[PDB]
């Protein structure tokens, strides 16, 4: 099996420079080049460069931001990137590749966070309706998950119970720090008359929150 | 630099109907040993790009024979004769002739489905947040259809556009609608000094903008 293996992701501060690995095994190392390429969140792909023994080209670009390296005789490539800001943040992929043959297989992608940020832990704050929902047959309820870095954070419900009608939603980034939220839509049968509980977890900061949404 | 356009940017079909993608480059993408360096690349959501055609027309081994691409010059197509599940994701067009090598911006293929209006919740803020010194009020707006949706928000009857942040869900795998959750974030002062909170959203679904309030006396 051709197989092309990067990096973990990577958590930086601003300023500061990374180095990510793109590992090749299942073919002869020195017949194919390797192209790194980025993708930065709801854009297209932008080539950095390739390399290859005997050829390392760069995208115009990024030219003073990126160093590629080859180590043949452990068959692995290394991008160096540096200077780093957070318009820095994408996924970085490194594919396979010649003229004749295109780019066939690919890494996995490599994730890259600059942020001056430090580890903190979420606010959870529970989201229940108060009294235009009482009459009705589905109530909506909610989670508000905020201030936190980095990501992830998980939600759940009822610890894991509660799967259907379920919409959690990606965080976004304010002054630094990430808020997200989820809504939960469950038969006013059986709440409050059942318990509906809201779980985080947040690992970075080895901290589990339970929420139960009571009325008010 | 080739610039790579594609259209449409999006594009909604039902299963088993046929797409067509078009892409254009800004110059030809002859390569000067005479070839023609244009390749289609389809990525689903968290996955690498994954190669379909390569050489304008050639499939790549393991691509099924609904997808077909073709064109010349600066002019190309891929085609897709029956849609399936699996096909939905990100189609890149590529050019690889002149250096800097480039990609189109992609095109978004979606499952086409019945309009839905959105259910709208609005959630003011938690008395446990207040404590705190912060005010968040959210609104969601679930399961509609399609994706174009105006949100807005009023305090005491007029518009407000600073400190709202609005969060999409893509196209849910079940029942092919989007959602979206709206928040508006206060300082607790500013939050106390306002009565009525306004969650609006305008959608194709209804001539009458879809509304949700409250008052903070309630």
């Known amino acids: 099996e051709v197989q092309l293996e990067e990096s973990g992701p990577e958590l930086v501060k601003p300023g500061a420079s990374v180095k990510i690995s793109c590992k090749a095994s299942?073919?002869?190392?020195?017949?194919?080049?390797m192209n790194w390429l980025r993708q930065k969140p709801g854009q297209g792909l932008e080539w950095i460069g390739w390399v290859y023994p005997g050829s390392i080209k760069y995208n115009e670009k990024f030219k003073d931001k990126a160093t590629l390296t080859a180590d043949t005789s452990s068959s692995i490539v290394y991008m160096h990137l540096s200077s780093l800001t957070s318009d820095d943040n994408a996924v970085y992929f490194c594919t396979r590749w010649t003229y004749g043959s295109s780019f066939d297989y690919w890494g996995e992608g490599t994730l890259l966070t600059v942020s001056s940020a430090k580890t903190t832990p979420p606010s959870v704050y529970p989201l229940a309706p108060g009294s235009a929902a009482q009459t009705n047959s589905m109530v909506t309820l909610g989670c508000l998950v905020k201030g936190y870095f980095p990501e992830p954070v998980t939600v759940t419900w009822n610890s894991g119970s509660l799967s259907s009608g379920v919409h959690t939603f990606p965080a976004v980034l304010q002054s630094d720090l990430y808020t997200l939220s989820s809504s939960v839509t469950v038969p006013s049968s059986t709440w409050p008359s059942e318990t509906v509980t809201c779980n985080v977890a947040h690992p970075a900061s080895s901290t589990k929150v339970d929420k139960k949404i009571v009325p008010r | 630099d080739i610039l790579m356009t594609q259209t449409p940017l999006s594009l909604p079909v039902s299963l088993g109907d046929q797409a067509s993608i078009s892409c254009r480059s800004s110059?030809?993408?002859?390569?000067?040993?005479?070839?023609?360096?244009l390749e289609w690349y389809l990525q689903k959501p968290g996955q690498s790009p994954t190669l379909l055609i390569y050489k304008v027309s050639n499939r790549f081994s393991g691509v099924p024979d609904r997808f077909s691409g073709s064109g010349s010059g600066t002019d190309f197509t891929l085609k897709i004769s029956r849609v399936e599940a699996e096909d939905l994701g990100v189609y890149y067009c590529?050019?690889?002739?002149?250096?800097?090598?480039?990609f189109g911006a992609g095109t978004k293929l979606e499952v086409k489905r019945s309009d839905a209006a959105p259910t709208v919740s609005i959630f003011p803020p938690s008395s446990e947040q207040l404590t705190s010194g912060g005010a968040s009020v959210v609104c969601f707006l679930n399961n509609f259809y399609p994706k174009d949706i105006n949100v807005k928000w009023k305090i005491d009857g007029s518009e407000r556009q600073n400190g709202v942040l609005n969060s999409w869900t893509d196209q849910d795998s079940k029942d092919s609608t989007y959602s979206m959750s709206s928040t508006l974030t206060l300082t607790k002062d500013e939050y106390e000094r306002h009565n009525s909170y306004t969650c609006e959203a305008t959608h194709k679904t209804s001539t009458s903008p879809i509304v949700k309030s409250f008052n903070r006396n309630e």
């Open positions: 590529f050019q690889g002739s002149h250096i800097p090598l480039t």
């Open positions: 299942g073919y002869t190392f020195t017949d194919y080049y």
């Open positions: 110059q030809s993408i002859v390569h000067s040993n005479g070839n023609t360096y």
